Design a protein around this ligand. Structure first.
Ligand SMILES: Nc1ncnc2c1nc(NCc1ccc3ccccc3n1)n2[C@@H]1O[C@H](CO)[C@@H](O)[C@H]1O
Length: 381
């Protein structure tokens, strides 16, 4: 009845779909060649609804009508303090409607529409759903969707409604740090064990303490920083180079923002190379006023610029071990999740915190959560 069911990580900044096929989890690439999709939606002036890479790629020219970060609003009331903080930093319009924070956008030709956070995520889920169905050759109807461990009843439910709207029956909602633990099969051992998931993504940092008892996962304590992640590290290097531009050219870069978004691009690119290389080069043709940008970043400078931010990632790890009444000696597994955990300093930091103990390694940290979900989805047909 339920067909092939899909594992979906519906993430804040990125999304991932997986499937179980011929005895293996298959992570599916979208129509753009990508194993992760931006949780992005956009409406061009022509009236063309773009979701994914296509929406993320044109957000510079369409900042009002490019919806992102809906996970911050999903399952929340308009008057929720968190929401009233969040909407201050969000360049599309959020209105109070049916007690909720509805996204307001121009659909094309100045024509106005509002969308509940669940309707946006339903668009993102539809893209994951068409991403899966293109790989499989068939329609998909059922799914396993993940949420962060802190999500409450209303947030969990609204994620299921995003699902329903997308034409997806969400059979299971599983916690994100749990799906990760399942991806490493940590649920396939006898014992009582403690698991620390340290999840550092694009715009969020989450640390979960889990206990596993014979396939029974329990979340004991959670911590983190809802506004700390890879984008933050981008900003810091962006600041470094804007400040360097000034000092050499005398020119100031935030006068054209299209220059700023260009730098954003080549910074994020350089950072990523720097998890693998010791130096990277940032090259921009017609950066500002037609002039060409060309600079490099050492890994040492990268680390230097974010050292206080990297280091701050330990404090949640301590508050978690406190609230779980456990010392450092008690953690039996360390699971790294999120693309930012590829940063070498981050790893050095985790490892020496826990007195030299090596983390679980082997699964792509961007994919670990959709993987966990796809494993469970695999059981469900
Ligand atoms: N190796 C890496 N090193 C440091 N940060 C990395 C990283 N890979 C990703 N992410 C995976 C990623 C993201 C975009 C990509 C684009 C082209 C090619 C590969 C890509 N890979 N991130 C950060 O994860 C956050 C959430 O993704 C973002 O802040 C991102 O910087």
């Amino acid at each position: 009845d339920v067909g092939t069911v899909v594992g979906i990580d519906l993430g804040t900044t990125y999304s991932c779909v997986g499937v179980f096929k011929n005895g293996r989890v298959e992570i599916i690439a979208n129509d753009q060649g990508n194993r992760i999709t931006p949780s992005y939606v956009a409406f061009t002036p022509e009236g063309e609804r773009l979701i994914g890479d296509a929406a993320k790629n044109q957000l510079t020219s369409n900042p009002e009508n490019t919806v992102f970060d809906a996970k911050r609003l999903i399952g929340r009331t308009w008057n929720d303090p968190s929401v009233q903080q969040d909407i201050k930093f969000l360049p599309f319009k959020v209105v109070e409607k049916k007690t909720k924070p509805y996204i307001q956008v121009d659909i094309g030709g100045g024509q106005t529409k509002t969308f509940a956070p669940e309707e946006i995520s339903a668009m993102v889920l539809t893209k994951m759903k068409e991403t899966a169905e293109a790989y499989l050759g068939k329609k998909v109807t059922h799914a396993v969707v993940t949420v962060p461990a802190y999500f409450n009843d209303a947030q969990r439910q609204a994620t299921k409604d995003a699902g329903t709207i997308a034409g997806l029956n969400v059979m299971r909602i599983i916690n994100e740090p749990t799906a990760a633990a399942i991806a490493y099969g940590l649920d396939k051992r006898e014992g009582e064990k403690n698991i620390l998931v340290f999840d550092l993504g694009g715009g969020t940092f989450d640390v979960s303490l889990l206990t596993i008892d014979n396939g029974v996962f329990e979340v004991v304590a959670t911590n983190g920083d809802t506004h700390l992640g890879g984008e933050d590290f981008d900003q810091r290097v962006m600041e470094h180079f804007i400040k360097l531009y000034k000092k050499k050219t005398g020119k100031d870069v935030r006068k054209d923002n299209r220059a700023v978004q260009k730098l954003r691009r080549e910074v994020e690119k350089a950072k990523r190379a720097l998890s693998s290389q010791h130096q990277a080069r940032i090259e921009i043709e017609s950066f500002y006023e037609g002039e060409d940008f060309s600079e490099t970043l050492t890994r040492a400078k990268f680390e230097e610029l974010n050292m206080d931010l990297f280091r701050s990632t330990m404090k949640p790890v301590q508050k978690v071990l406190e609230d779980s009444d456990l010392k450092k000696s008690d953690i039996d597994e360390i699971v790294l999740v999120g693309g930012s955990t590829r940063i070498p300093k981050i790893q050095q930091l985790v490892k020496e915190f826990f007195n030299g103990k090596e983390p679980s390694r082997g699964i792509n940290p961007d994919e670990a959560v959709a993987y966990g979900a796809a494993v469970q989805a695999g059981v469900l047909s």
